[PDB]
């Protein structure tokens, strides 16, 4: 039945206009109400607006009403004068509602189908490759930890592997955090037998495709 798929540029500059579109398929577009909902990193779900497929008439969140435009085979969202706080996953959705009467009052919307969502990031940073620093320790304890600190890159993502992917057990690669600089940072760590540090070489392999950067870093006992 219903299928939604949103699209739009993954990067928007502050003060500019954010534009996302939703492809509605499998249904009569005109018969239903369609709209947008977002969720910023570490924040709650936030309804932006929903409009009628036939008329284009709908309603907006009062906190967002000033800078929001939703129009309609597809629906589209334009959000003007964005800031870093507008960084979010943007979801297309169908909004259902019901009569609240015995009266002309309607409920607002609940959402019975959602699209996969499209990440949009708002930022002034330019593309930049990662720095890669070794995290090194020991043989008094049975297991050692070592790692790579991958930082000062933009935009996401980086990938990290160990020993060209031949080392996989016990690897933990943390989600990236946005620094105050506007650049991202994460660590990748692995645990290994301490008895191995003398004869085995450990190398982290870092890839940042947006900047075409590939780094190999030997991690050794300092």
């Amino acid at each position: 039945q219903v299928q939604l798929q949103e699209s739009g540029p993954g990067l928007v500059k502050p003060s500019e206009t954010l534009s996302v579109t939703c492809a509605v398929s499998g249904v009569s577009f005109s018969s239903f109400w369609w709209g947008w909902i977002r969720q910023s990193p570490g924040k709650g779900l936030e309804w932006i607006g929903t409009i009628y497929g036939s008329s284009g008439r709908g309603e907006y969140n009062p906190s967002l009403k000033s800078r929001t435009t939703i129009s309609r085979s597809q629906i589209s969202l334009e959000l003007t004068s964005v800031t870093a706080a507008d960084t979010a996953i943007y979801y297309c959705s169908r909004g259902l509602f019901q009569p609240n009467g015995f009266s002309f009052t309607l409920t607002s919307y609940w959402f019975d189908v959602w699209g996969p969502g499209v990440p949009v990031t708002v930022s002034s940073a330019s593309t930049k490759g990662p720095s890669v620093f070794p995290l090194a320790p020991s043989t008094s304890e049975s297991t050692a930890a070592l790692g790579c600190l991958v930082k000062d890159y933009f935009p996401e993502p980086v990938t990290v592997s160990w020993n060209s992917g031949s080392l996989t057990s016990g690897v933990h690669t943390f989600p990236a955090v946005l620094q105050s600089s506007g650049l991202y940072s994460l660590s990748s760590v692995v645990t290994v037998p301490s008895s191995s540090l003398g004869t085995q070489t450990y190398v982290c392999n870092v890839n940042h495709k947006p900047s075409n950067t590939k780094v190999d870093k030997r991690v050794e006992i300092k």
């Binding site: 409920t107 607002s108 019975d112 969502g117 620094q179 660590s187």
Partner: protein, 213 residues
Amino acid sequence: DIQVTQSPSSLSASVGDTVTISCRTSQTISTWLAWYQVKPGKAPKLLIYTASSLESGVPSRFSGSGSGTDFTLTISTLQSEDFATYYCQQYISLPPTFGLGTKVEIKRAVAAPSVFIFPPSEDQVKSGTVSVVCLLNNFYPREASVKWKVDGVLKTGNSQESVTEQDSKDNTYSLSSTLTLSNTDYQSHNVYACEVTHQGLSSPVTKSFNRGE
């Protein structure tokens, strides 16, 4: 905005358990409440609408109840596929607003973290900005506290935490705490320590290094 409040923020459970999650609103919403299930990176799915109507296709072990300001989601005989975050949402009036969610995670035995501290490499120091990393590896439950101490003194600020999702195999968490300092500040202190408190530890564990040794 109608404020929507979920409780608890997270709960640990096991397959076979019956779990209940609370949703409360700041004013009456009659029965105009929806419940959603979200898994990482996936689109939310509608489970229940008008507080107690089961969405088509959703397993019968999900049931919603309540009205006015007090609502409940009950998952009977929890299954592996049900570990997720659950959101409630009111829609009596504009704007529709969402609770901040209840994460349902996998219960397992208590495990203390293994703690490691990593001094900044010489090329960090050369760069003029350094990051000290403290690693908490393979622990359960999620709750853990990291104190940074610099020459014995509590260092607040300039640190960020990052945590992994529950491991698919052993159901543990790992966590990093990263302390970022100008090299000038870094050089102005001698001993760096992260102090970790956790249910699995009878006493806090402290890992430290002396700068430049």
